[PDB]
Write a protein that holds these residues in place. Sequence first.
Motif, short mmCIF file in Angstrom:
data_model
loop_
_atom_site.label_atom_id
_atom_site.label_comp_id
_atom_site.label_asym_id
_atom_site.label_seq_id
_atom_site.Cartn_x
_atom_site.Cartn_y
_atom_site.Cartn_z
N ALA B 212 0.82 -1.20 0.00
CA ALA B 212 0.00 0.00 0.00
C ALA B 212 0.85 1.26 0.00
CB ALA B 212 -0.92 0.00 1.21
N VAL B 213 2.02 1.21 0.64
CA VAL B 213 2.82 2.42 0.75
C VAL B 213 3.67 2.62 -0.50
CG1 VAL B 213 4.84 3.34 1.90
CG2 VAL B 213 2.83 2.70 3.21
N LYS B 214 4.31 1.57 -0.99
CA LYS B 214 5.32 1.70 -2.03
C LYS B 214 4.78 1.55 -3.44
CE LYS B 214 8.03 -0.48 1.35
NZ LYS B 214 8.86 -1.65 1.74
N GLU B 215 3.50 1.24 -3.61
CA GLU B 215 2.94 1.04 -4.94
C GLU B 215 1.61 1.73 -5.14
OE1 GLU B 215 2.95 -3.01 -6.12
OE2 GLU B 215 4.99 -3.38 -5.40
N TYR B 216 1.04 2.35 -4.11
CA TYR B 216 -0.20 3.10 -4.25
C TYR B 216 -0.15 4.41 -3.48
CZ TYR B 216 -1.71 -1.35 -6.12
OH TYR B 216 -1.81 -2.50 -6.86
N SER B 219 -0.49 6.88 2.96
CA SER B 219 0.16 7.38 4.16
C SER B 219 0.32 6.25 5.17
CB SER B 219 -0.66 8.52 4.76
OG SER B 219 -1.67 8.02 5.62
N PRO B 220 1.49 6.10 5.78
CA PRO B 220 1.67 5.02 6.77
C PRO B 220 0.61 5.02 7.86
CG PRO B 220 3.77 6.05 6.25
CD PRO B 220 2.73 6.88 5.59
N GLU B 221 0.19 6.21 8.29
CA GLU B 221 -0.77 6.31 9.38
C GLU B 221 -2.05 5.56 9.05
OE1 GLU B 221 0.75 8.53 7.53
OE2 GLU B 221 0.88 10.50 8.50
N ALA B 222 -2.60 5.80 7.86
CA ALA B 222 -3.86 5.17 7.48
C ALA B 222 -3.72 3.66 7.39
CB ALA B 222 -4.31 5.74 6.14
N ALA B 223 -2.63 3.19 6.79
CA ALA B 223 -2.38 1.76 6.70
C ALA B 223 -2.37 1.12 8.08
CB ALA B 223 -1.06 1.51 5.98
N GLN B 311 13.59 -2.80 13.30
CA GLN B 311 14.16 -1.79 12.43
C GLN B 311 13.44 -1.67 11.11
OE1 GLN B 311 16.81 0.04 14.33
NE2 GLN B 311 15.24 -1.25 15.29
N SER B 312 12.30 -2.33 10.96
CA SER B 312 11.52 -2.21 9.74
C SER B 312 10.74 -0.90 9.75
CB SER B 312 10.56 -3.39 9.59
OG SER B 312 9.75 -3.55 10.73
N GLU B 313 10.33 -0.48 8.55
CA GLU B 313 9.62 0.79 8.41
C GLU B 313 8.32 0.77 9.21
OE1 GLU B 313 11.26 2.95 7.08
OE2 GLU B 313 12.67 1.95 5.72
N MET B 314 7.58 -0.33 9.11
CA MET B 314 6.32 -0.45 9.82
C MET B 314 6.49 -0.21 11.31
SD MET B 314 3.57 -3.31 8.80
CE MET B 314 3.77 -4.53 10.08
N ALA B 315 7.57 -0.74 11.89
CA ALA B 315 7.76 -0.63 13.34
C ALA B 315 8.06 0.81 13.74
CB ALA B 315 8.88 -1.56 13.78
N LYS B 316 8.89 1.50 12.96
CA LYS B 316 9.18 2.90 13.25
C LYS B 316 7.93 3.76 13.15
CE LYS B 316 13.66 2.19 11.08
NZ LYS B 316 14.35 2.29 9.77
N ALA B 317 7.14 3.55 12.10
CA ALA B 317 5.89 4.29 11.95
C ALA B 317 4.96 4.01 13.12
CB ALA B 317 5.24 3.92 10.63
N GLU B 318 4.83 2.73 13.50
CA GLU B 318 4.02 2.38 14.66
C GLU B 318 4.52 3.10 15.90
OE1 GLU B 318 3.66 -1.90 15.54
OE2 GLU B 318 4.24 -1.40 17.59
N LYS B 319 5.84 3.26 16.01
CA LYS B 319 6.41 3.97 17.14
C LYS B 319 5.93 5.41 17.18
CE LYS B 319 10.82 3.85 19.54
NZ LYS B 319 12.28 3.63 19.39
N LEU C 188 -9.52 0.93 -1.03
CA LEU C 188 -8.42 0.00 -1.22
C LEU C 188 -8.06 -0.70 0.08
CD1 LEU C 188 -6.10 -1.19 -2.83
CD2 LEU C 188 -4.78 0.84 -2.31
N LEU C 189 -7.92 0.08 1.15
CA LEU C 189 -7.50 -0.47 2.43
C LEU C 189 -8.57 -1.40 3.00
CD1 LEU C 189 -5.95 2.73 3.94
CD2 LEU C 189 -4.73 0.77 3.05
N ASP C 190 -9.81 -0.91 3.09
CA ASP C 190 -10.87 -1.73 3.66
C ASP C 190 -11.02 -3.05 2.91
OD1 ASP C 190 -12.90 -1.47 5.86
OD2 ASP C 190 -14.25 -2.01 4.21
N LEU C 191 -10.76 -3.05 1.60
CA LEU C 191 -10.94 -4.26 0.82
C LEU C 191 -9.73 -5.18 0.86
CD1 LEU C 191 -12.74 -2.73 -2.24
CD2 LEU C 191 -13.72 -3.92 -0.30
#
Lengths: 328, 328, 328, 328
Positions: B212-216, B219-223, B311-319, C188-191
């Motif tokens: 969702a982040v790298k191909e569409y 925003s990390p927050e929404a994901a 150290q993954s992107e998801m974890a930093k964003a979650e932080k 996209l996200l919800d689906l």
Amino acid sequence: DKTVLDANLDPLKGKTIGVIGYGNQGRVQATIMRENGLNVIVGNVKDKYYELAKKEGFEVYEIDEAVRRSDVALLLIPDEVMKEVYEKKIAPVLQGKKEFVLDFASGYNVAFGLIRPPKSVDTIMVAPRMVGEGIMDLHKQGKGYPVLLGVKQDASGKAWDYAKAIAKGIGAIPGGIAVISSFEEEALLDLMSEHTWVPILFGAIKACYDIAVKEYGVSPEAALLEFYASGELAEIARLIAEEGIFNQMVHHSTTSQYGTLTRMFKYYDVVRRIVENEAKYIWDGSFAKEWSLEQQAGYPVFYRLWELATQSEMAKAEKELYKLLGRK
Amino acid sequence: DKTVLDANLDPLKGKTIGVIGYGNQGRVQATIMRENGLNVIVGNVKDKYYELAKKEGFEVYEIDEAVRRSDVALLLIPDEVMKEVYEKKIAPVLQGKKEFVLDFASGYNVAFGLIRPPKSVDTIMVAPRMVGEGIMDLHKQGKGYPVLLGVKQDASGKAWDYAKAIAKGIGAIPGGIAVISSFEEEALLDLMSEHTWVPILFGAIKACYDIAVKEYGVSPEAALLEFYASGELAEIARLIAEEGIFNQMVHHSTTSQYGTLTRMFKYYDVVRRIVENEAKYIWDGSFAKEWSLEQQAGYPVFYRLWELATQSEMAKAEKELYKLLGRK
Amino acid sequence: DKTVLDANLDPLKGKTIGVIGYGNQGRVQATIMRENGLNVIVGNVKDKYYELAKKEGFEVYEIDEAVRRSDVALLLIPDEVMKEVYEKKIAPVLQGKKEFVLDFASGYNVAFGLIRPPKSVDTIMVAPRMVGEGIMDLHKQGKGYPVLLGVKQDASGKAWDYAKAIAKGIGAIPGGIAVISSFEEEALLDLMSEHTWVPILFGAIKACYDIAVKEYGVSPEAALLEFYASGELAEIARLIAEEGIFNQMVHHSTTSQYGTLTRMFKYYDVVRRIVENEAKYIWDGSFAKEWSLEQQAGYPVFYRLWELATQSEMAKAEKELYKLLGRK
Amino acid sequence: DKTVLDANLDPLKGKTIGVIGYGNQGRVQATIMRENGLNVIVGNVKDKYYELAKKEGFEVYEIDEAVRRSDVALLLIPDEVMKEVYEKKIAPVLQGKKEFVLDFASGYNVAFGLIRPPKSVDTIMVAPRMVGEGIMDLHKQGKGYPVLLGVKQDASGKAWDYAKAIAKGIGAIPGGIAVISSFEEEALLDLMSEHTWVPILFGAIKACYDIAVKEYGVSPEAALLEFYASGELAEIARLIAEEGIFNQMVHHSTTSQYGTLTRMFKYYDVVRRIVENEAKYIWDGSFAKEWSLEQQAGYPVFYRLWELATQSEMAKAEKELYKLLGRK
Ligand SMILES: NC(=O)C1=CN([C@@H]2O[C@H](COP(=O)(O)OP(=O)(O)OC[C@H]3O[C@@H](n4cnc5c(N)ncnc54)[C@H](O)[C@@H]3O)[C@@H](O)[C@H]2O)C=CC1
Ligand SMILES: NC(=O)C1=CN([C@@H]2O[C@H](COP(=O)(O)OP(=O)(O)OC[C@H]3O[C@@H](n4cnc5c(N)ncnc54)[C@H](O)[C@@H]3O)[C@@H](O)[C@H]2O)C=CC1
Ligand SMILES: NC(=O)C1=CN([C@@H]2O[C@H](COP(=O)(O)OP(=O)(O)OC[C@H]3O[C@@H](n4cnc5c(N)ncnc54)[C@H](O)[C@@H]3O)[C@@H](O)[C@H]2O)C=CC1
Ligand SMILES: NC(=O)C1=CN([C@@H]2O[C@H](COP(=O)(O)OP(=O)(O)OC[C@H]3O[C@@H](n4cnc5c(N)ncnc54)[C@H](O)[C@@H]3O)[C@@H](O)[C@H]2O)C=CC1
Ligand SMILES: O=C(O)C1(C(=O)O)CC1
Ligand SMILES: O=C(O)C1(C(=O)O)CC1
Ligand SMILES: O=C(O)C1(C(=O)O)CC1
Ligand SMILES: O=C(O)C1(C(=O)O)CC1
Ligand SMILES: [Mg+2]
Ligand SMILES: [Mg+2]
Ligand SMILES: [Mg+2]
Ligand SMILES: [Mg+2]
Ligand SMILES: [Mg+2]
Ligand SMILES: [Mg+2]
Ligand SMILES: [Mg+2]
Ligand SMILES: [Mg+2]
């Protein structure tokens, strides 16, 4: 950029330093530092190297004694057994400390968690890329050499300046340079080389020999002379280090240039896949497991491969030949 | 059927019982049993948990002492090191006994032969499926919980009735239930979960984020909010446990139902193959080898994967996000 | 960043608002807004929910009447039939307007062009991620919740400030947060969730049950208890939402951690391919076609899959068991 | 076994019956029942068949009128449009009833949920396997025929006895038999035939013609005579129905037997895979979707394939030939 060309020497003047080992690095760096104006000591297994260490005029107590006296310690010893030695004879003493700084030559044991000192110790690395004799072969020239800086744990907000202080404490900058880099990068790099292009090179040479002999009726002597028994590779490597890898080829024939370039760009994807696989295998920690277990089992595979390599046809032929040329 | 809804308490009244450990289960089951009218003791490593154990009014000798006094012992301690502890401090004492009964919480060590007590001891298991706090969260409600009964060795023709005696000795039936099952089934089941749907779920979530982040351009927050940063999954799981897995979906939209069902039946074969492979890998004993060796080597892979995950992107964003929402 | 923690409430004070529906959101958000100091109305199908709406003291005219009176309207109704309802009973009235603002809970119908209001209406979205009861379970705590902001059409240069005005009009910020995002991202996200990790999880569980029973002779009861009949998953999900997905695992055994991490990184590519395929299928509009046609045909596949899921062995066993435990 | 050879006729005597349609079945079964001593009525589209129905002396009101008068109704009409007709002209009236019993000839619409009557109606099926003329070709012989019994919904605890009452009400048992089977089984079976061996047979014949003509220089006339223009297949099928499928072959040459058996066992796996695929496609509800949508679109594929089949070389040759032989 991230490079550093020279820096301070303040935080180490007034403190004692703990030097563990008197091998290649230990001796060189220790003598350098003593000659850089610092109070230093040595810790060593009491054997021939201890004879040589006390010979060159370095008071050498036991390991733990040298750590009790010092507020810094550098572990200039192997990577295959250091774990136990740290567990028994260093971890206790260290627990008996506050404000300690431990620096290594290789990140294998730390990057993979085989050694986890307390949060009471600023943890750092630096590592040079020579084999060690080149560094006196440069120090007597008043030169400096390049190295890779790393910090693992910071409990004093001073780990980096301690890093550069040590750096200058060993005669690298000014004269060479100093790069900054995690423990992880150093280990990854040192292992990629030992797993990708060295073995590929050797296997290619071996295959060329085997093919030329068993499918085109060639004399072993000529094959050995062409491939490696000559010092061609050494001169090529020297020119690479001096001028550059590609600019080096201007001193070759156009035929060689053309063939080399074409076949390089033709096979790049294959070796790329291989390098990907091996780098992944390393990043995950699998190789460290493999190697530690091969130690615990008694080094069987090591033994058998050492045997197979020496009992190969190429090795016997090299033996006969090197004998002929007087080469030991 | 094979279920048991309540049973006797006779063979344990008049005997002493050996409780090894005061962690989650140890404390809960021990307090329950003391409150069930039985003479009991405790064995524990003399540390903070020993402080808490002697705090709550349980005489706690050393391990071997508690086994000498008891004719039953329950080993309510970890699964990664229990081997050595049994080899040194329990096997001798046990050899000094006749008529002993040893019950565990997990079958890993016994199902795979890492612990083989003598034929002088009726060997049994039972294991609950909570994390442990739910069991007081049920006992203060006067309820009972479900568990899995197993017998490994019978030298008294009474192992099963001892099993149910213990069962009722911990406040599971009446109020919950008790299933009977080999050591093997318990281990197989506990490991299939940890190897099949938990990691698949996590990897799917991670992949959804990355895509969702790298191909569409999302925003990390929404994901994070959609996938797991919300408590949607918790409510779904609750409804599953209450009503049923499928009947749960009646509270969803028809769109969700349709998509979920179609894609479930569409991908069933793939995950089936995966589950087959992993279950086979377990039944044979390979994973136990893998894990024991990873202990002996120093936990390198464990370390590196823990690092890569954080150290993954998801974890930093979650932080960053959890910080924003005040969540610790 | 793109987040918004609280904002104004000006453009909605002095205007009337049109609330279409009195279900979960409709009731909650409507009551919230009435309690936020705004003049509001309700539009609803005159049925039980209309009884409840006029019960709680909301004047409820017909749909089109509530749109004639309001200059804003929010369509808090389903996603499978909303098309026709907009075509017949809303589009005409809307054509009888100037300066209108329409906000939805889901972007399915707008992101895919099934509803295209005129250029005389600022078109926006926001959507929360709960099921709806959590929002009163938070409002009585004086808290706020997170949501996703979107603007489709701007004919007043004020769509965004209207967005945040609405946001604060429902009691989300301050207390929670508000993200901004297209209609497209929300859909996209919800689906993706409903198509990737939910069905994969369910299929994995089902496969584990089938395998354990038909190839290792296990009792259905034990399988159900291990996999989902226990509330293990619920507690795990709670800890995830509280602490973090990975930090959650510190409360597990090292065995579980190791297996989970290894198998996660081992299967990441497969699920990645799957997620790619499904996300592509959605971005193009194919799934909307599929689902709309499945409605037009009479829901045959829906019906048959609902049947197959309930007539499966796992479901019957779950029935017997849940009966035993008293669970309805 | 599950078979039933004859049964009662009680629950239908004293009640009125609703017969919807006067086609093949409608006429036959209706006349049979009238001749079985029951009060019956007819519902029909007022057209030529209505002329014929009122001709044979059956009072025929409108559909809904015949349902208002009857407490049982049988829907002896097509499967492609019955949905709408039930939605408009039958569902209302039925809502105006209590204690109703609806029986069909095919389970397509019910097995796939296209028609869901209320829980106020015992829902059943039975279906014979002829084309319909054979049943008078048997009734004038005083014989009975076989059928398949099914019950979908039971709101009177009498659906099964109503089933057998109807069965005997149409002259099947005694004389034939009556099998019991879900709606699902009937639909699955009727569709597997139409999807597996009929089309395979036809395609094989067509391929044989094409090959023999275009690769071995054969006259179309001879090919047509061998493959199907002769009545060989009819006699074979008759012998199959009389003696048995395999015992039938005793009247063939040993050469034919040998080739047939060998090639049958040689190709069994292929057709097995095909049948698996198609049966799965049906069980899920996919084909019903396909066919309903092909109706909604205007029957394009139907049209084009009908054209391609008739404009093929084989069809033109068959035309010329059948003309020669006087066959219409
Ligand atoms: N040419 C090289 O091998 C280079 C090595 N390094 C690093 O420096 C370190 C030294 O490597 P090498 O000297 O080549 O290895 P080595 O094989 O020469 O090790 C021999 C030394 O290790 C000691 N030793 C061996 N086994 C021992 C044991 N069980 N317990 C205690 N001491 C034991 C011995 O006393 C001896 O002094 C390595 O860790 C490596 O990371 C860095 C640059 C190049
Ligand atoms: N939440 C969980 O982890 C669950 C645990 N179990 C089972 O209960 C057992 C307990 O699991 P956890 O408490 O979570 O593991 P843990 O990682 O929390 O173990 C910590 C305990 O192990 C002791 N210990 C650690 N290393 C030791 C060593 N070398 N020598 C002697 N003692 C040592 C320590 O004194 C400490 O009290 C496991 O074996 C598991 O099969 C069953 C249900 C859930
Ligand atoms: N738990 C959930 O299902 C969630 C739903 N949403 C969104 O809110 C909306 C509501 O979803 P649900 O209430 O769960 O669906 P639902 O299946 O519960 O829909 C039932 C409602 O739709 C009405 N309705 C049904 N058919 C109708 C028809 N032909 N004509 C007119 N009205 C009809 C009924 O009056 C009834 O009030 C969805 O569109 C969804 O996008 C957002 C968050 C979660
Ligand atoms: N030989 C066969 O086709 C078999 C048929 N059946 C079952 O019996 C039923 C009859 O099948 P067939 O007579 O062959 O189909 P058909 O194609 O001959 O249907 C023609 C009849 O359907 C009516 N009809 C057509 N379109 C209509 C519409 N829009 N609205 C209202 N009425 C319409 C016509 O009035 C006409 O009476 C089927 O449902 C089938 O399940 C069972 C065994 C064999
Ligand atoms: O391999 C050789 O001998 C070289 C050539 O060009 O022939 C120098 C490179
Ligand atoms: O994922 C979502 O938010 C749900 C929806 O139907 O849209 C509740 C399941
Ligand atoms: O570590 C274990 O054994 C757990 C289980 O699946 O029961 C808690 C995770
Ligand atoms: O196909 C034929 O004509 C038969 C033969 O045996 O030759 C009768 C079957
Ligand atoms: Mg190197
Ligand atoms: Mg190296
Ligand atoms: Mg478990
Ligand atoms: Mg476990
Ligand atoms: Mg959602
Ligand atoms: Mg949804
Ligand atoms: Mg048929
Ligand atoms: Mg048919």
